[PDB]
Amino acid sequence: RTIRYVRYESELQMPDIMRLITKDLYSIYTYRYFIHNWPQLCFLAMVGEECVGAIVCKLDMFRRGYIAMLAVDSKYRRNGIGTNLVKKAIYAMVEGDCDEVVLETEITNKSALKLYENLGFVRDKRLFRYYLNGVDALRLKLWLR
């Protein structure tokens, strides 16, 4: 069971991308726009002839990066795919002259919070009822300079 990490350069994988998003947690035009403007930041984790995980990020002007989506298949979690996927996106952001990488998450997602804390991310703000479900959210940012 060999896993692979591949950037975004094709037009076949967006249908695979959405399948890995709606089954984990938005409109199709959100992903379309994010892939459009920043194709150099969207990464996928493919094992065999399918896609196991995905990350979609945007970097916009201090030049601040943003991590929009990070999802892994249920049968393939806890293998370190997410940590490597986030590392190979932070590195691409760094090669793009970014100053801070910000993101938002649910306070209930303890696994994601522990993962990002291990990666070095530090909580900066807490938002009340920020998510449409009703749960409070946490804003985690990593400063590079």
Partner: protein
């Protein structure tokens, strides 16, 4: 279906209404009102009541009066919340979506209609005061209780809108009545028509123009009445420091937006309580805190017309930062941290102006106004730092330097400020002795926690983030970024922090048992201070300190030394200081 299009259809009843129908309708409308007050919209919660859309169509006096009361309560609440402006983007939705919200009828008329409906129902209750008769009597009691509660709540909301704050003192007694009434509305809760999309409600009324269970309604309303009664007592204060402490204590409970807005509007755009001027309140706070020579009636500086026109300018310059500080306290506990961080620039400007004014006054014949401004600024910074603990914004490995900043640097400055203020008070001659004692307990708690975290990191019991581009330096700079806008006290950078926090000065360098014993001695001093002075906060601090001392004394003896599991930090006992358990 729309109310106007359904009155002709016959799906809703506007007259000859049964008592259980009214009980259920009033309970559902109360739940909708409470849900709206919790931060949701109006077209989704309150306006789902078809009756409230046009109460002129209701022929039954009771239902129409209840609809008018609900609409007027919504009007007053929206007006007060908009005036106060202490609600975030998503903590309240004040848009009315173009609804005629009972502006045609006066509020006193609504109160009179409610009183008439209550009297013409107490008469019915007395007519049967002694099975079908018992059920009718119970339903009448339920209806009367709901009507009376609506009337008294609307009366309190009205009395809170009077120009004079003294009217609030005419409403507090009414709250006591609610204590003997809400339980009644709770007791006869099974009489109303249960939902199944209940009768008289269409939740999908608003789809082209764009709840809580009944059991939780009574407790929520009781808590809200308690909050309003707590708010009402703020009119008895006379010094800005006491009002600041009151605002902080009120916000510590995380009150609802209505309560915070009511407190904000009752406190103050230019006159406090409608009686005192904020300039005079600032001067009184200065006189009671530092007692500068200019403010002393017989110190020859009051008679000077140019020192007066130098102190008054400073007072007028300080009036807006304080209003902003109170407003920041009025917000919820999330944006409070950022607003505290941002008020630092304004307070630094105020500190510079105070220093210049004090220097000029001394030259014309030190550090009185500067001391007062420094005290307030230190309070702001300490509260800002502890708020991150309140919001779980700090990671495990960030505890040691946050606690070191709080204890070794910020609280030392606070003690110097307080001691100098008391000395100047004595020189011009114990309202700060309690504050000094509380700060002593807080500083000892923070110092013990800091030593604990340092020893834990030395022992390897704290998990650090290992990844190539994450450095402590940038984290430390960004965590304490708001402190760059202040000048006195100077910001402590990473290099100075590592220099002072290093353990290589002491020969030999301390090991884990020594730091554990030091933390135990700090916790013991905190306990010996607190348990000799009491209110709830002292009890919470003592309950967070007493087990901590015995835990650290046990752990200093070599227990669980070889283990590497990260200890748990329970913040249930106290907001800011955790109880470090080993299990």
């Amino acid at each position: 279906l729309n109310f106007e299009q359904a009155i002709k259809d016959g799906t809703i009843k506007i007259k000859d209404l049964t008592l259980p129908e009214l009980i259920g309708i009033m309970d559902t409308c109360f739940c909708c009102l409470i849900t709206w007050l919790e931060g949701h919209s109006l077209a989704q919660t309150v306006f789902t009541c078809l009756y409230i859309h046009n109460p002129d169509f209701i022929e039954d006096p009771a239902m129409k009066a209840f609809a008018l009361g609900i609409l007027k309560i919504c009007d007053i609440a929206r007006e007060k919340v908009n005036k106060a402006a202490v609600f975030e983007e998503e903590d309240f939705q004040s848009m009315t979506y173009g609804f005629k919200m009972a502006n045609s009828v006066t509020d006193l008329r609504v109160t009179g209609m409610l009183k008439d409906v209550e009297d013409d129902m107490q008469r019915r209750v007395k007519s049967t005061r002694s099975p079908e008769v018992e059920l009718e009597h119970q339903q009448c009691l339920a209806v009367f209780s709901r009507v009376k509660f609506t009337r008294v709540l609307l009366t309190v909301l009205i009395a809170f809108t009077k120009k004079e704050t003294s009217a609030v003192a005419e409403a507090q007694k009414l709250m006591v009545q609610a204590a003997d009434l809400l339980s009644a509305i709770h007791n006869s809760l099974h009489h109303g028509i249960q939902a199944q999309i209940m009768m008289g409600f269409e939740p999908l009324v608003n789809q082209r123009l764009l709840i809580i269970k009944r059991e939780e309604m009574v407790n929520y309303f009781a808590r809200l009445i308690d909050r309003i009664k707590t708010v009402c007592e703020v009119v008895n204060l006379t010094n800005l420091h006491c009002i600041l402490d009151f605002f902080c204590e009120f916000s510590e409970q995380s009150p609802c937006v209505l309560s915070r807005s009511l407190l904000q509007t009752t406190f103050l755009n230019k006159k406090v309580f409608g009686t005192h001027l904020m300039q005079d309140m600032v001067k009184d706070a200065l006189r009671s805190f530092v007692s500068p020579p200019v403010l002393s009636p017989k110190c020859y500086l009051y008679n000077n017309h140019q020192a007066k026109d130098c102190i008054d300018s400073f007072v007028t310059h300080c009036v807006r930062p304080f209003c902003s500080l109170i407003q920041i306290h009025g917000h919820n506990r999330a944006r409070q941290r950022d607003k505290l961080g941002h008020i630092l620039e304004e307070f630094a400007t105020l500190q510079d102006e105070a220093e210049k004014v004090d220097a000029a006054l001394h030259t014309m014949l030190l550090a009185c106004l500067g001391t007062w401004v420094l005290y307030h600024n230190l309070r702001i910074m300490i509260q800002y730092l502890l708020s991150g603990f309140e919001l779980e914004l700090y990671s495990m490995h960030e505890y040691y330097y946050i606690y070191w900043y709080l204890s070794e640097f910020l609280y030392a400055w606070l003690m110097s400020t307080l001691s100098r203020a008391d000395g100047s008070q004595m020189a011009e001659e114990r309202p700060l002795s309690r504050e000094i004692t509380m700060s002593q307990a807080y500083q000892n708690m923070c110092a013990g926690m800091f030593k604990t975290m340092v020893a834990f990191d030395m022992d390897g019991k704290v998990r650090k983030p290992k990844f190539e581009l994450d450095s402590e330096q940038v984290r430390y700079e960004h965590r304490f970024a708001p402190f760059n806008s202040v000048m006195t006290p100077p910001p402590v950078h990473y290099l100075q922090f590592k220099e002072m926090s290093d353990l290589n000065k002491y020969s030999p360098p301390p090991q884990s048992p020594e730091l554990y014993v030091a933390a135990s001695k700090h916790f013991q001093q905190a306990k010996m201070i607190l348990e000799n002075i009491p209110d709830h906060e002292v009890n919470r601090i003592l309950k967070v300190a007493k087990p901590n001392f015995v835990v650290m004394k046990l752990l200093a003896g070599g227990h669980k030394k070889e283990s590497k599991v990260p200890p748990e930090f329970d913040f249930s006992a106290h907001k800011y200081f955790p109880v470090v358990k080993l299990v």
